[PDB]
Amino acid sequence: HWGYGKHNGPEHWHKDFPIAKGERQSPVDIDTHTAKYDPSLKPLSVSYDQATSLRILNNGHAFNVEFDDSQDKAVLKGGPLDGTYRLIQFHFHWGSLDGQGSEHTVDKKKYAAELHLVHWNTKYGDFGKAVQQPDGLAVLGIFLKVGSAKPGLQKVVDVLDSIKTKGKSADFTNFDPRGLLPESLDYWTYPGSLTTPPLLECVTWIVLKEPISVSSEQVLKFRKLNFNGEGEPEELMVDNWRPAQPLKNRQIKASFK
Ligand SMILES: Cc1cc(=O)[nH]c(SCC(=O)c2cccc(S(N)(=O)=O)c2)n1
Ligand SMILES: [Zn+2]
């Protein structure tokens, strides 16, 4: 029953998931002026050439594009990470209006949407074990602004009408996630959490400084999805973002400047 409505949205989550008020919750506002440059941070290594997408799923909260993570085919390493993390899925958060939708903010600015490419640390052998560990996940976050279309997004947008409602899925092979990346891999990083229940404090966040542009029509199509199942009243899947959480005792590190 958690979700993003008036009665079960983010401000309610702590009653089922008390870690919602924990010490390393996400997202957060990224104060660009107070981010610490760390000249010992390494370039991020994104190795997506052998990625294998499988399926796209409407889970009732967002849509996931899922990958075969049974081998080291699409991996993230380097950057602030020790060892190697396997891509398991990506998804987005977005708004009802172009002026909101991102989970992280930059100097309090909201983007129209945010892409999360979720990876798990191979030393834990699977995603369900990894989320129980403080260094189990590496989530690469990329902001979306509305402007020119992103052509490598259009395969995703065009399949959405087949997964409109909660529970629907569709085969989704040969999707190349390199088409969703901006030119620069400059990033911020900080230790945080999943941004939806169960809110587990298992994530190394890596947030790219450069947003990708998508067109207004591409984001409009995300807003035609539904939170409800087929044959239930229509509740459009919009504003599926958690607001910024207290930074507490954390420092955001920058790979640049
Ligand atoms: C329950 C389940 C089964 C599975 O096979 N795969 C997954 S992937 C879960 C996931 O990627 C995710 C789960 C919750 C939150 C976030 S976020 N917004 O990037 O912090 C990501 N979940
Ligand atoms: Zn997410």
Q: Is the CB of 139 under 6 A from ligand 1?
A: yes
What is the domain range of residue 53?
1-257
| For the CA of 193, the nearest atom of ligand 1 | 20
Residue that has been written with the tokens 């909101």 in this structure: 100
- Assign 3-class secondary structure to the chain: CCCCCCCCCCCCHHHCCHHHHCCCCCCCEECCCCCEECCCCCCEEEECCCCCEEEEEECCCCEEEEECCCCCCCEEEECCCCCCEEEEEEEEEECCCCCCCCCCEECCECCCEEEEEEEEEHHHCCHHHHCCCCCCEEEEEEEEEECCCCHHHHHHHHHHHHHCCCCCEEECCCCCHHHHCCCCCCEEEEEECCCCCCCCCCEEEEEECCCEEECHHHHHHHCCCECCCCCCCCCECCCCCCCCCCCCCCCCEECCC
Answer yes or no: is 196 a known binding residue: yes
Beta bridge partners of residue 109, listed in sequence order: 106
C-alpha R_g of the chain: 17
Encoded tokens for 132: 């129980």
Answer yes or no: is 93 a known binding residue: yes
Answer yes or no: is 195 a known binding residue: yes
**CATH code of the domain in which 87 resides:** 3.10.200.10
Q: How far does the centroid of ligand 2 lie from the alpha carbon of residue 54, in Å?
A: 19
- State the total domains in the chain: 1
Q: How far does the centroid of ligand 1 lie from the alpha carbon of residue 18, in Å?
A: 18
Q: Is the CB of 144 under 6 A from ligand 1?
A: no
Q: List, by residue number, the catalytic residues.
A: 61
Q: Is the CB of 104 under 6 A from ligand 1?
A: no
Return the ligand number nearest the Cα of 115. 2
Burial 126-145 (b: 16+ CB within 10 A, else e): ebeebbeeebbbbbbbbbbb
Cis, bond preceding 80 (omega within 30 deg of 0): no
| For the CA of 139, the nearest atom of ligand 1 | 19
